[PDB]
Amino acid sequence: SLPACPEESPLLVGPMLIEFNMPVDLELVAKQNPNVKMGGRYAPRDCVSPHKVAIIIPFRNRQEHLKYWLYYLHPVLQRQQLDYGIYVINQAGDTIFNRAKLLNVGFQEALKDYDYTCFVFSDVDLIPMNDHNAYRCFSQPRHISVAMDKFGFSLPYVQYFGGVSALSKQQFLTINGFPNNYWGWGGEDDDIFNRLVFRGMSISRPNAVVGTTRHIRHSRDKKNEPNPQRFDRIAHTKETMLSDGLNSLTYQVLDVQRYPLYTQITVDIGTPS
Ligand SMILES: CC(=O)N[C@H]1[C@H](OC[C@H]2O[C@H](OCc3ccccc3)[C@H](NC(C)=O)[C@@H](O)[C@@H]2O)O[C@H](CO)[C@@H](O)[C@@H]1O
Numbered sequence: 001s002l003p004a005c006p007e008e009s010p011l012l013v014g015p016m017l018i019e020f021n022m023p024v025d026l027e028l029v030a031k032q033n034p035n036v037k038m039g040g041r042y043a044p045r046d047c048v049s050p051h052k053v054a055i056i057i058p059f060r061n062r063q064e065h066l067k068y069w070l071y072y073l074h075p076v077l078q079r080q081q082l083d084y085g086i087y088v089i090n091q092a093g094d095t096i097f098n099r100a101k102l103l104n105v106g107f108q109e110a111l112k113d114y115d116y117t118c119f120v121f122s123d124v125d126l127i128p129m130n131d132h133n134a135y136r137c138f139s140q141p142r143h144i145s146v147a148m149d150k151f152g153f154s155l156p157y158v159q160y161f162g163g164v165s166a167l168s169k170q171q172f173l174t175i176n177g178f179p180n181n182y183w184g185w186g187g188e189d190d191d192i193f194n195r196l197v198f199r200g201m202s203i204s205r206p207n208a209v210v211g212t213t214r215h216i217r218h219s220r221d222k223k224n225e226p227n228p229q230r231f232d233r234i235a236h237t238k239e240t241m242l243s244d245g246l247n248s249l250t251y252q253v254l255d256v257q258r259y260p261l262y263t264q265i266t267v268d269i270g271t272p273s
């Protein structure tokens with residue numbers, strides 16, 4: 001009996017002021033977000049969203065960025081009228097970071113909670129500056145963080161697909177998900193670009209003004225040195241995607257914690273094989 005939410009949300013206020021120089025108390029954020037239900041789940045009370053979105057954050061040792069992420073995104077995602085949940089996929093151990101493998105774990109695990117049909121993949125340190133930048137899926141894969149301050153508020157190259165993106169359930173399945181063997185920094189987002197292009201798709205984007213995005217400045221994380229194999233790996237995507245991704249994935253979930261504003265899945269994703 002509730003009617004469809006309108007196509008575009010009437011609640012959006014467009015551009016927003018974004019800053020990362022004050023402390024954040026998630027207790028307060030939770031109290032400022034009374035409609036967000038345990039585990040960081042929200043759907044509107046007044047209408048049915050067609051956007052059933054699981055937002056997936058690859059994570060290790062960035063608690064400070066996460067509280068900023070939570071503080072800014074939760075109110076925006078509510079104004080966008082999404083039926084959404086947050087998933088922080090926390091890499092166990094202290095071995096080399098694997099961004100794309102976490103994202104896969106995220107897709108697969110989230111699906112167990114709820115019938116999500118859209119996946120937003122978001123780095124922890126990127127915050128949109130305009131709530132017209134929709135954190136849901138389109139008829140083609142969606143690149144969301146299109147004009148980041150750190151790249152001068154434009155794309156750093158036209159095939160860039162890093163930062164924040166969104167794939168529908170079907171688009172993610174169609175590329176066999178993300179690669180598992182990009183260990184350490186660099187290039188997994190280029191490989192994913194390739195995967196989309198090899199399956200007949202193109203990149204949807206908002207304009208540079210709406211897609212304005214802030215990156216929280218930070219120094220290097222240890223255990224994520226540039227991957228020196230990344231260039232050879234991206235040159236073979238077409239062949240390797242056939243058997244490397246969802247259909248070749250295993251992991252062991254160590255812990256699932258429902259916090260009021262996000263579900264955190266701690267996971268053993270292993271070391272290179
Ligand atoms: C492969 C990689 O390291 N990608 C990074 C990227 O690195 C800087 C790099 O970006 C462009 O090249 C991407 C690329 C894609 C396929 C094969 C080889 C390289 C850029 N190319 C152009 C035409 O402008 C090149 O000049 C640069 O050195 O940086 C981004 C943002 O930090 C990461 O998201 C990628 O993973």
Ligand SMILES: O=c1ccn([C@@H]2O[C@H](COP(=O)(O)OP(=O)(O)O)[C@@H](O)[C@H]2O)c(=O)[nH]1
Nearest residue numbers: 058059060061062097099123124125221224
């Ligand atoms: O030790 C790490 C390495 C990276 N990441 C996650 O992976 C993303 C991408 O890595 P990074 O911030 O280094 O990209 P950069 O800003 O250096 O280009 C981060 O936003 C986090 O979501 C993390 O949580 N812990």
Ligand SMILES: [Mn+2]
Nearest residue numbers: 125215216218
């Ligand atoms: Mn970063």
